[PDB]
C-alpha cells in the first residue's frame, strides 16, 4: 500500500498506517494525520466546499478494513486488469510453445497443455516461466516483453510476476494411452503442487513453501525442481533472473554431457556424495565437494559447472504420498537429467 502511488500521498498514507499500526483507536489518532491533509487541502483555492473532517476518517477506516480482513478488496478494475494480463500471457506462451516445436492442445491464460519433444522441454519451461513473470530476451511476435511488463510498441501492460506457476512434464512413450497419461499429468500437478515443501528464504529467514515446482515423471522416476527460492517471488528487478535459475543449471549440465565433457556416470554417482553433503553446514566445503563429484566424472581437460551455492541445503519434503522424491534439490537435478535422458531412449 505504501509502495503504490508515488505522488505526494505516500507519506500521508504511511502516516495513516502508522495510525492503524498498533491499533490506535478510531480517529483517536487521526489527529496525527488529518494535519498532513489539512495543511495540503489549503494549497488550492478553487476547492469549493470543505470536506476534510471525515475523508481522513474514511481513509483509515478503509485501510484498517484491508489490514484487518487480510486481503486487498477486489473491484472490477482489479479483475479486468488481471484477466487481461492473463490473455496477454496467453498470447505470449502461444508463440513460446511454437518456438519449441510444440503443439498446443490447450493454453488459456494460467493453464497450458502442450506436447513437446523431450529435447526442448527444459528450455521451454525456463522461457515460459520467465515470460509468465514478464521477463524475457527475445520478442515473441509483437509482444516485446520487458522486466515485468509487456511492451506492445511502446504500450506497457503489466504481467503476473508475483504469481507462481507450476509445471508437470510427463515423458511418455508415443504409444502410451493418452487417457492415463493425461490423468497422471493432471494428478501429479494438482497433488504434488500442494503436498511438497522446499526451503525458501523469507525476509532473510528459511521457511517452507508450497507452489512453483516442476514435477517431472518418467515411468517411475520423479523429480521436483523449485522455481522461486524466495517466497515473495519478486519484490525488485533483481529477482527476475532468479526465476527458474535451476532449470538453466540443469541445462548447462545437459550441454556438458552432450559435448562429452562430463560422463553420464555423473548421474549414477551423486549418492556417495550426498550423505556427506547434507550433514554439512560449511558452504566452502560443500563447494569443494561438488567440484570433486564433477571432477571425478569429467572427460575433458577441465570442465567448469560451479553450482550456484544457493541451492545447497535446499530441502524438499512430502506429506507421505506415494510420490518418492529426494529431499535435496541437487539430487532432484540428477533425477531430472535421468528423466530427460530416458526421454531419448
Amino acid at each position: 500500500l505504501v509502495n503504490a502511488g508515488s505522488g505526494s500521498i505516500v507519506d500521508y498514507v504511511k502516516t495513516v498506517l502508522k495510525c492503524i499500526r498498533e491499533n490506535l483507536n478510531k480517529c483517536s489518532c487521526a489527529e496525527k494525520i488529518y494535519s498532513n491533509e489539512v495543511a495540503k487541502v489549503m494549497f488550492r483555492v478553487n476547492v469549493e466546499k470543505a470536506n476534510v473532517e471525515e475523508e481522513v476518517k474514511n481513509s483509515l477506516e478503509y485501510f484498517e478494513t484491508i489490514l484487518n480482513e487480510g486481503r486487498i478488496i477486489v473491484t472490477p478494475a482489479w479483475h479486468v486488469s488481471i484477466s487481461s494480463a492473463l490473455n496477454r500471457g496467453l498470447l505470449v506462451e502461444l508463440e513460446l510453445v511454437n518456438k519449441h516445436k510444440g503443439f498446443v492442445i490447450y493454453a488459456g491464460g494460467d493453464d497450458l497443455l502442450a506436447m513437446l519433444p523431450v529435447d526442448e522441454v527444459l528450455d521451454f519451461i525456463k522461457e515460459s516461466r520467465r515470460a509468465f513473470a514478464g521477463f524475457g530476451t527475445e520478442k515473441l511476435g509483437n509482444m516485446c516483453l520487458e522486466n515485468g511488463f509487456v511492451r506492445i510498441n511502446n504500450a506497457y501492460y503489466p504481467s503476473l510476476p508475483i504469481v507462481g506457476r507450476s509445471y508437470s512434464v510427463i515423458i511418455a512413450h508415443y504409444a502410451d494411452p493418452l487417457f492415463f497419461v493425461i490423468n497422471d499429468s493432471y494428478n501429479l500437478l494438482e497433488e504434488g503442487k500442494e503436498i511438497i515443501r522446499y526451503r525458501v528464504m523469507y525476509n532473510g529467514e528459511y521457511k517452507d513453501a508450497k507452489k512453483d515446482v516442476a514435477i517431472f515423471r518418467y515411468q517411475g522416476l520423479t523429480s521436483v525442481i523449485p522455481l522461486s527460492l524466495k517466497r515473495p517471488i519478486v519484490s525488485s528487478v533483481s529477482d527476475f533472473n532468479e526465476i527458474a535459475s535451476i532449470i538453466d543449471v540443469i541445462l548447462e549440465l545437459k550441454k556438458r554431457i552432450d559435448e562429452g565433457r562430463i560422463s553420464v556416470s555423473l548421474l549414477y554417482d551423486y549418492e556417495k556424495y550426498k550423505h556427506l553433503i547434507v550433514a554439512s553446514d560449511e558452504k566452502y566445503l560443500t563447494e569443494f565437494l561438488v567440484k570433486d563429484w564433477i571432477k571425478r566424472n569429467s572427460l575433458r581437460k577441465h570442465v567448469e559447472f560451479t553450482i550456484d551455492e544457493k541451492l545447497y541445503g535446499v530441502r524438499l519434503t512430502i506429506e507421505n504420498y506415494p510420490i518418492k522424491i529426494p529431499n535435496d534439490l541437487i539430487s532432484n537435478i540428477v533425477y531430472t537429467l535421468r528423466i530427460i535422458y530416458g526421454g531419448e531412449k
Partner: peptide, 9 residues
C-alpha cells in the same frame, strides 16, 4: 543481431 534487453544491474 539477435538483440536482448538489458537494464542496469
Amino acid at each position: 543481431m539477435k538483440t536482448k534487453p538489458v537494464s542496469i544491474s
